[PDB]
Amino acid sequence: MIGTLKRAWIPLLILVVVAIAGFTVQRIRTFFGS
Amino acid sequence: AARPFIPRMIRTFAVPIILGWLVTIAVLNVTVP
Amino acid sequence: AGNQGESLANESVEAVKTIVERLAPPPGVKVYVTGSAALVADQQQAGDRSLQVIEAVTFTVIIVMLLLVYRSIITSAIMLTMVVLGLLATRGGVAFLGFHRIIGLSTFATNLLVVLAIAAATDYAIFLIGRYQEARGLGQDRESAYYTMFGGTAHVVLGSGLTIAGATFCLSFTRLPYFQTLGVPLAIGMVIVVAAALTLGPAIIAVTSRFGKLLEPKRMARVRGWRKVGAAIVRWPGPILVGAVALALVGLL
Amino acid sequence: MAATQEEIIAGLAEIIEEVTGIEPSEVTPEKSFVDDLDIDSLSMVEIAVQTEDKYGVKIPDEDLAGLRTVGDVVAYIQKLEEE
Amino acid sequence: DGHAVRFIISHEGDPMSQAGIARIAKIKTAAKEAIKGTPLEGSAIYLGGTAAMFKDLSDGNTYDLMIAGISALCLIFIIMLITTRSVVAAAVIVGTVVLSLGASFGLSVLIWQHILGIELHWLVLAMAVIILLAVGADYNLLLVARLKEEIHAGINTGIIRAMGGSGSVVTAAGLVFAFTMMSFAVSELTVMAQVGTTIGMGLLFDTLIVRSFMTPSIAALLGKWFWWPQVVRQRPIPQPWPSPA
Ligand SMILES: CCCCCCCCCCCCCCCCCC(=O)OC[C@H](COP(=O)([O-])OCC(O)COP(=O)([O-])OC[C@@H](COC(=O)CCCCCCCCCCCCCCCCC)OC(=O)CCCCCCCCCCCCCCCCC)OC(=O)CCCCCCCCCCCCCCCCC
Ligand SMILES: CCCCCCCCCCCCCCCCCC(=O)OC[C@H](COP(=O)([O-])OCC(O)COP(=O)([O-])OC[C@@H](COC(=O)CCCCCCCCCCCCCCCCC)OC(=O)CCCCCCCCCCCCCCCCC)OC(=O)CCCCCCCCCCCCCCCCC
Ligand SMILES: CCCCCCCCCCCCCCCCCC(=O)O[C@@H](COC(=O)CCCCCCCCCCCCCCC)COP(=O)(O)OCCN
Ligand SMILES: CCCCCCCCCCCCCCCCCC(=O)O[C@@H](COC(=O)CCCCCCCCCCCCCCC)COP(=O)(O)OCCN
Ligand SMILES: *P(=O)(O)OCC(C)(C)[C@H](O)C(=O)NCCC(=O)NCCS
């Protein structure tokens, strides 16, 4: 429902950014050594 | 009291804050290398 | 016996230098101790000999810059006390948590932590004093100017400091020990710098402001020049943006 | 649609105060921005910007240079108001 | 016990150059191809030394830089989003941060590599991006918070007031720290001089070009779209001219 999702859009965007960045970081953390 | 709580408290207790930071720095700098 | 980077390596290099240059060589010959382990030792022992000159040159520059910003000796002295106390608290806390083996330090994290702490402390002190003096130049009395300074700058200081403490804690996830060892100590030092800037700074301002004309402004005509810059920006923003991007392209190319 | 000359000067003088510092007691309809008030061409730009922001009176760049006195600005604003 | 044999290899020019580091993979490939089809095939090949260590450090440095950059840029975006309730302001600040960092490091590369002839040490990039990101976060947050708190009187008047108020302060702070970092040029150690002058040139360019003209210019172009998710007015409802005095 849009009325309540567009009220917490900042925490949702922060969560999306944190998730994407964390997955990309844990992916890059495996390139060294191998 | 029409002033916010945090700056009002930092302003009322201004000199104990300064002295507390002073003894903190003193201990932290003389009790360890 | 050591391991390039550790202190046992320098132990061993200086011990070998002692053994070698302890007894005289035959006439007409000289003996040296090279390798990328005596170079590292000499580099790490001359770095702290040049940093003792840098520690004086940076403060000699700080004092001049402070006198140029605030055309006043007492204001520069007050701000310098703020910065020095923040730096001292940061160094003490980090050296304490490293000495008691609570956190893992390094002789590179220290040289970077000093720089970051001085930067943050100077920035926050300038922010606080500048907001206070700007509110003072608009007519507000000392108490109203103190509260305007706090309400305008404290949350900025807190947010920026916590962002730096998080960014330089995410270095703990890197793989190189150079960067990996920067995470915890730099984050803790940032937390200490922020706590100092947000409690001791305002307290020093609230104490010194109630004596004579200590923190009263002098350079208020700089606000007018910066207002004229802002006017030029809001009137012709397109050309100014084109010029700025053209200047940035010089470096980006 | 007939904001009086005194009213326009009153609203303009409290922008001139914030921009420069000249008291509204000095802003009289015969003073020159360059000579008497000593207001450069870049402070006039922000006087015009703040006038447009506060009272909606838009003064372009080509017309801002030809307003030498305070009376010229008042006359410009009144003639713009007349439409 | 005779199960391992070792070879001591020397380079021709500088071992720690870009060529001496690229030679490590070639040495390993040559050793692997020499035992191909022999009774020694399938043996383990180990290569140690200084150029091998620096090859490993070279590979790891770029991934560590990417990790730190991703983390720092995401943290900066998050704090700009929390402070200014705006996606466009946060994205513009992140973009200007990236552009300023790039331009500053390019200017330092110019000054040192092309003019002075000395290349930049491999740690200068990391030590510079760390400090530059931190101080840029400081100064950008202080500017946009004032912008947000003053655009209520009009976006143009708000930008003028925010400049006159906080641009002075961020410029003073940036200049102070830039000139205390450029004081490292007196060191005998060229790596310290390079780090100091890189941070100093980066802060000079940043505070005198990017934060001084480019960020408020972008805020002025995008009038109400700088705060997009929030609905702001370009200017308030016009007021009537006040009664005299
Ligand atoms: C041991 C050795 C170690 C080495 C280090 C040691 C050295 C130690 C000593 C260091 C000495 C430096 C001392 C610094 C002084 C500190 C000043 C201070 O505290 O700050 C507040 C300071 C207050 O000044 P004030 O003396 O108190 O008086 C106030 C005015 O007089 C008020 O009077 P007014 O109202 O009548 O009007 C004047 C008004 C101004 O009024 C106006 O004129 C308005 C103009 C509107 C602009 C309209 C067109 C806009 C064009 C857009 C295009 C975009 C790009 C434009 C670039 C700028 C073009 C102007 O002035 C202002 O107040 C605001 C000035 C705005 C400044 C913006 C210009 C930025 C310059 C950017 C170029 C620099 C390149 C950076 C790249 C560096 C690369 C490494 O603010 C300033 O005025 C800025 C002055 C200094 C800022 C930096 C300028 C140079 C300083 C050093 C930089 C070195 C770079 C050289 C590189 C060479 C290139 C190849
Ligand atoms: C290492 C990578 C790590 C990550 C990198 C960093 C990641 C973050 C990226 C940063 C993102 C930037 C944020 C931009 C968002 C702003 C858009 C917005 O929502 O505002 C609405 C805004 C609407 O405002 P408006 O049109 O004025 O509304 C009409 C008014 O109501 C009434 O209209 P009026 O009567 O006032 O008429 C006048 C009006 C005109 O009114 C109109 O009707 C114009 C409408 C047509 C324009 C739209 C056409 C766009 C078609 C192309 C779209 C390109 C988008 C690219 C992807 C997004 C950007 C990344 O004049 C204007 O306002 C137009 C000027 C505004 C643009 C000026 C520049 C501001 C943009 C910020 C970038 C600064 C440029 C620096 C250059 C960098 C050089 C390297 O959108 C626009 O139309 C402005 C266009 C913005 C151009 C963006 C170009 C960015 C260039 C950088 C790209 C680099 C990416 C490379 C990635 C890596 C590749 C290797
Ligand atoms: C370097 C790391 C950077 C990573 C960051 C990635 C950036 C991705 C940006 C994605 C943009 C998504 C923003 C979501 C829109 C939020 C607007 C909304 O939902 O509510 C607004 C309502 O306004 C609207 O009605 C607009 C609705 C249209 C939204 C459509 C979403 C557009 C998605 C943009 C796509 C751009 C993706 C770019 C990806 C690179 C405001 O509500 P409010 O006033 O109650 O809350 C404010 C108080 N806190
Ligand atoms: C490694 C550990 C750290 C990890 C941290 C990860 C990243 C965390 C990100 C931190 C975000 C913190 C956000 C706080 C500032 C956000 C700015 C904001 O929300 O804007 C509002 C800010 O609102 C607030 O006031 C937020 C509360 C901040 C008050 C600051 C009080 C400082 C406390 C002094 C003691 C400091 C001791 C803290 C030690 C760390 C606008 O308020 P206003 O303009 O109306 O005026 C405010 C003052 N009247
Ligand atoms: P004043 O006589 O000093 O004139 C100043 C101004 C800046 C008003 C100038 O002469 C002018 O009228 N137009 C130039 C536009 C401009 O400055 N654009 C931005 C610089 S890229």
Pocket lining: C245 vs ligand 2, CB cutoff 6 Å: yes
Resolution value (Å, 1 decimal) = 2.6
Q: Go through E94-126 and write b for each residue having 16 or more CB atoms within 10 A of its CB, e for each that does not.
A: bebbebbbebbbbbbbebbeeeeeeebbebbbb
D41-55 vs D5-19: helix axis angle to the nearest 10?
120
Query: What is chain D's alpha carbon radius of gyration, rounded to the nearest angstrom?
Result: 11
Angle at E111 between CA E108 and CA E115, to 5 degrees: 155
Residue pair C78/C208 in contact (Cβ under 8 Å)? The answer is: yes
Experimental method: cryo-EM
Rounded distance between C-alpha atoms, residue D53 and residue C16, angstroms: 77
Counting beta carbons within 10 angstroms of the beta carbon of residue C251, is it exposed (0 to 12), middle (13 to 18) or buried (19 or more)? Answer: buried
- Whether residues E78 and A28 touch (CB distance < 8 A) is answered with no
Please identify, by atom number, the ligand 2 atom nearest to the C-alpha of residue E221: 63
- H-helix segments, C23-72: 38-69
Q: Which residues lie below 8 Å from residue B22, measured CB to CB, with a gap of 6+?
A: C85
Query: What is chain B's alpha carbon radius of gyration, rounded to the nearest angstrom?
Result: 14
Rounded distance between C-alpha atoms, residue C165 and residue C158, angstroms: 10
Q: Under DSSP, is residue C121 helix (H, G, I), strand (E, B) or coil?
A: helix
Counting beta carbons within 10 angstroms of the beta carbon of residue B3, is it exposed (0 to 12), middle (13 to 18) or buried (19 or more)? Answer: middle
Residue E36: count other Cβ atoms within 10 Å of its Cβ: 9
Rounded distance between C-alpha atoms, residue E142 and residue E134, angstroms: 13
Counting beta carbons within 10 angstroms of the beta carbon of residue E80, is it exposed (0 to 12), middle (13 to 18) or buried (19 or more)? Answer: buried
Q: Go through C181-220 and write b for each residue having 16 or more CB atoms within 10 A of its CB, e for each that does not.
A: bbbbbbbbbbbbbbbbbbbbbbbbbbbbbeeeebbbbebe
User: Which of E76, E78, E225, E228 to mutate for ligand 2's pocket (most ligand atoms within 8 Å of CB)?
Assistant: E225
Residue located via tokens 């590979």: E59
Q: Facing residues of D32 across strands?
A: D69
Nearest to E186 by CA among C16, C155, C57: C57
Residue pair C146/C206 in contact (Cβ under 8 Å)? The answer is: yes
Q: Under DSSP, is residue C6 helix (H, G, I), strand (E, B) or coil?
A: strand
Pocket lining: E171 vs ligand 1, CB cutoff 6 Å: yes
Domain map (residue ranges) of chain D: 3-83
Q: Under DSSP, is residue D61 helix (H, G, I), strand (E, B) or coil?
A: helix
C38-69 vs C7-22: helix axis angle to the nearest 10?
120
Question: Which residues from chain D sit within 8 angstroms of residue E153, using beta carbons?
Answer: 53-54
Residue pair D63/D45 in contact (Cβ under 8 Å)? The answer is: no
Q: Go through D45-55 and write b for each residue having 16 or more CB atoms within 10 A of its CB, e for each that does not.
A: bbbbbbbbbbb
Catalytic pick among D40, D53, D63, D72: D40
Q: Tell me if residue D53 is catalytic.
A: no
Rounded distance between C-alpha atoms, residue E27 and residue A24, angstroms: 33
Nearest to D49 by CA among E208, C237, E215: C237
Rounded distance between C-alpha atoms, residue E79 and residue E141, angstroms: 8
User: Which of E78, E81, E82, E140 to mutate for ligand 4's pocket (most ligand atoms within 8 Å of CB)?
Assistant: E82
Please identify, by atom number, the ligand 4 atom nearest to the C-alpha of residue C165: 1
Rounded distance between C-alpha atoms, residue E128 and residue E198, angstroms: 7
- H-helix segments, E84-167: 87-109, 124-150, 155-162
Q: Facing residues of C4 across strands?
A: C6
**Tokens read off for C165:** 């403490």
Pocket lining: C235 vs ligand 1, CB cutoff 6 Å: no
Which residue's alpha carbon is nearest to atom 45 within ligand 3? A7
- 3-class secondary structure per residue, E166-235: HHHHHHHHHHHHHHHHHHHHHCCCHHHHHHHHHHHHHHHHHHHHHHHHHHHHHHHHCCCHHHCCCCCCCC
CA atoms within 13 A on the CB side of C65: 23
Residue pair E132/E101 in contact (Cβ under 8 Å)? The answer is: yes
**Tokens read off for C63:** 């004092």
Q: Which residues lie below 8 Å from residue C231, measured CB to CB, with a gap of 6+?
A: D42, D43, D45, D46, D49, E160
Counting beta carbons within 10 angstroms of the beta carbon of residue B31, is it exposed (0 to 12), middle (13 to 18) or buried (19 or more)? Answer: exposed
Q: Under DSSP, is residue E144 helix (H, G, I), strand (E, B) or coil?
A: helix
A and E touching (3 or more beta-carbon pairs closer than 8 Å): yes
Rounded distance between C-alpha atoms, residue A9 and residue A6, angstroms: 5
Q: Which backbone phi and psi does D32 adopt, to 5 degrees? A: -95, 130
Q: Facing residues of D69 across strands?
A: D32
Nearest to C75 by CA among C226, C224, C212: C212
CA torsion through residues C72, C73, C76, C82, sign: negative
Residue located via tokens 């466009």: E88
CA–centroid distance for C65 within its chain: 15
- Whether residues D19 and C234 touch (CB distance < 8 A) is answered with no
B and D touching (3 or more beta-carbon pairs closer than 8 Å): no
Largest CA distance in chain A: 49
Q: Which backbone phi and psi does C202 adopt, to 5 degrees? A: -55, -35
